[PDB]
Amino acid sequence: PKYTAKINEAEENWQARAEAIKKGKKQNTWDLFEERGYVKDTAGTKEHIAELMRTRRIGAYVGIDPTAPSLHVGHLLPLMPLFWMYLEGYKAFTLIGGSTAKIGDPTGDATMNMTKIHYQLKKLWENVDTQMRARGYEADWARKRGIVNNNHWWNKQPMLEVLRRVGHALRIGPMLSRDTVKNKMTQGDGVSFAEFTYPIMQGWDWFELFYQQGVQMQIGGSDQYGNIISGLEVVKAARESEPDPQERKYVTPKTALDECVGFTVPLLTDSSGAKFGKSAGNAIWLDPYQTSVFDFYGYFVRRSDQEVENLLKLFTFMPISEITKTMEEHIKDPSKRVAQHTLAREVVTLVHGKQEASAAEDQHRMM
Amino acid sequence: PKYTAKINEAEENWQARAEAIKKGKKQNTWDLFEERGYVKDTAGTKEHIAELMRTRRIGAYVGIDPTAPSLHVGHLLPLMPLFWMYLEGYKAFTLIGGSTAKIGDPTGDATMNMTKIHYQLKKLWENVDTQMRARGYEADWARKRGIVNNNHWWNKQPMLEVLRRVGHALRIGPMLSRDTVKNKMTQGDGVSFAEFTYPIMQGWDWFELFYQQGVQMQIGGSDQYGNIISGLEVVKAARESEPDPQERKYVTPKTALDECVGFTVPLLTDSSGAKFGKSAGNAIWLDPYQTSVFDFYGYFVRRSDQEVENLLKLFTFMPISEITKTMEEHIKDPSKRVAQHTLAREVVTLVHGKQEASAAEDQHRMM
RNA sequence: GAGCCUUUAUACAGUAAUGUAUAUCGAAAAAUCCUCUAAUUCAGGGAACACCUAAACAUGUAGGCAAUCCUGAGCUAAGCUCUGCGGAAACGCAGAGAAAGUGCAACGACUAUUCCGAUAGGAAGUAGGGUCAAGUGACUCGAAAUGGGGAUUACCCUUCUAGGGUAGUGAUAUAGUCUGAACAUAUAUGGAAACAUAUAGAAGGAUAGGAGUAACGAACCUAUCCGUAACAUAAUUG
RNA sequence: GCUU
């Protein structure tokens, strides 16, 4: 139909792009991730990954365990590179763990929570867009974002399906041997069949997104590597055992590049020692009635000049080009901290919109 | 309603019989069990299972995975006691693993494979019922038999629920400490996620049966012992997990009577140090066009002059009483196989009808 | 809406009327009698209405409800066919089967009566219920095959008096009695909701016992769980 | 033409 018409039209567009990158005419979204520091580890030839990106209009996602009734800054890290991918035209999504929470990542009223979170996420996009169009970005039809909920399928997802479609492929070996969890049995109480299986699901999720949305990438927590790997395995397993001949033409690991890869953003902390996201005790929440807009503006303007550089490139949607401009201005007057007042205002916008974020500057820049 | 009064009828009688055992008048089903040597191991108190069988028309089943196109003579023994219970007036079942086959018990097309067994169990049951009334057995309203496919439910069993309804109380520790496993990892190969779950499955199955009919007792192969244990585990957590309380009022283990016990038949192997089912050129099946009636008949007519005894108790619904009589004629002439004919015939007749029982004996009676 | 037959069309089927198949159609229908009504459970899969809901997903969907199409296990009244024994006959017993019914009523419970009528129904007051009394009393309702099996009939066909075929679905509840069914409810689990399931609802109600009986019942005695919030209400609906 |  006419719908398929625009689809193929997009392919070409994405090729003029794949071209520019070929002759370094435009940076590779991947080398963009290296330019702001979003790469800690990689489950997929750092290089390969790159090509897979310059080339195809791939997709990715970021999962969030709806355990808290609000996300905190610590989640903003991994969502950034996603966002960027979005700004380029890829297919990005944010998977909510509505069901997974019920088990929880064994790394080491529930509705009410799950609910809030959803909305909390859409809001961001609502701003990422406003931001995207504003900071000078072009309208791409094919471009694709969205919010999913692992429950959507897991709620009825029969076990026979899973246990068979992949159960024969995995082996408790590189599972029970997994340090993160294995360590839990030794140095801990132990583990519930749920926990042991949690990964397995995290992998059925990745696949679901591939099978249901063409996802060849997953961005996650620094500690989520051990998971991103195990997921992978599960991903493929299903693609392999596709008992459908006409559907094998899809899912089955065709071309070499047709491989799902991922990358764990780095684990950050404050110039001192306190882990990132936490503050004295709790954390830098996002929920206004739990972290006033002011306080928010605070933990950001707080960061000293030692990190402002590395952390400025991490949480702002600003061309490193213009970044060094703000930084080169700040360094000629560290005391006044022009760079700290700006970086803070910038991130408060994205999450809390300009209108407020601007007023919030008045408070903290007053007296 | 009338139907109501009916269930009550059989109920009352059950107490009359509960008394006979209480005042020595009829062997408690379970005594007839350990007596005819059907028992080798037990999960629950020897007296526990006793009392329960005195005051409860409990339900019990025998699991059978359709991995082969025919039930081999081995599958008899385990079923045998079951049949007896049906005879005494219980709730007995035979479970078909039409889905668990893609997994199988770990220890060390296919669609029709199952079909074959279906038709089987049936026809068999028929004769069981047949011989029953055939020999002074008064039917009972409450006495019921039946077969049930395991896919019956697995076909669409929600992963989420399951995992929760029991995973939150199961540790992969002891679940992996079962030797059956440790070996299937150290020695030999490895243990997949799938097969790892078989123990849980067979456990759930039980739960089902306990729910859909009132089956609170498993009867498995001499080796299936472990499963009988790992299974019972899932069983408990299940009756607890039940969300709606009102239901819990029934489904949850209230008094010590609502205790589900399971026992395992012995390991019966021929005087050939080989399972009593993996002998001959490969095995000894029931399928006529896979094991000549004659050849079958033989498997019995020829057996240890000593074995006859305990072999009659295990494969013939012959009253202990005249069972010894057969031993009277036999000993007057060891090499005459007087008892071997009677014990051989029984088996054939049971799994092949009287008409054949004779026809076979004839061939095995020539010059 | 859906099914039945029905108009016509083709199609595989036959000795042929006719048979099965899809679609179209509606122009008149759609024989009688007798006998059986037991079992009444455990799941499973699908579904027209446009019929409520709208949390997701980009009105499209989706979940619910549902006329209702079925499958597995078990069970079942009188017959049915194969084989074995009995018989003179019947039928009997045995086993192998082949229909068919529960399952598959508005959540269910319960019953297969006479008379008259072209029917709808009318009269009986049986079957079996409801209410009040307390005792074997009053009062008030009040009735089904539309299936299974066996006959008879008429019909036309005929490889033409001997076979063959045609004489509709309707019971996933029909009659009818009840009714926790009916509540946009209360409650509790499950859902975002619509809902589904379980109790309960004009302080009582429910089940399991004690006693006592000729037996059931009223009333007593024990325990138990439900409410103790307003509606349940009378037509009316399966 | 009838039917739940």
Swiss-Prot record, chains A, B:
E.C. number(s) listed in UniProt: 6.1.1.1
Localization in the cell: Mitochondrion matrix
Entry keyword set: Aminoacyl-tRNA synthetase, ATP-binding, Ligase, Mitochondrion, mRNA processing, Nucleotide-binding, Protein biosynthesis, Transit peptide
Region (Involved in splicing): 1-37
Residues holding ATP: 65, 278
Superkingdom per UniProt: Eukaryota
Motif 'KMSKS' region: where in chain: 275-279
Residues given in the record as L-tyrosine binding sites: 61, 105, 198, 202, 205, 224
Position of sequence motif 'HIGH' region: 66-75
Enzyme class: ligase
Catalyzed reactions per annotation: tRNA(Tyr) + L-tyrosine + ATP = L-tyrosyl-tRNA(Tyr) + AMP + diphosphate + H(+)
Any one GO cellular component localisation term in the record: mitochondrial matrix
Biological-process GO terms, alphabetical: Group I intron splicing; mRNA processing; positive regulation of RNA splicing; RNA folding; tRNA aminoacylation; tyrosyl-tRNA aminoacylation
GO MF annotation, one: RNA binding
Stated role: Catalyzes the attachment of tyrosine to tRNA(Tyr) in a two-step reaction: tyrosine is first activated by ATP to form Tyr-AMP and then transferred to the acceptor end of tRNA(Tyr). Has both an aminoacyl-tRNA synthetase activity and is involved in the splicing of group I introns. It acts in intron splicing by stabilizing the catalytically active structure of the intron.
Family in the record: Belongs to the class-I aminoacyl-tRNA synthetase family.
Name of this protein: Tyrosine--tRNA ligase, mitochondrial
Biological source species: Neurospora crassa (strain ATCC 24698 / 74-OR23-1A / CBS 708.71 / DSM 1257 / FGSC 987)
Encoding gene (name): cyt-18
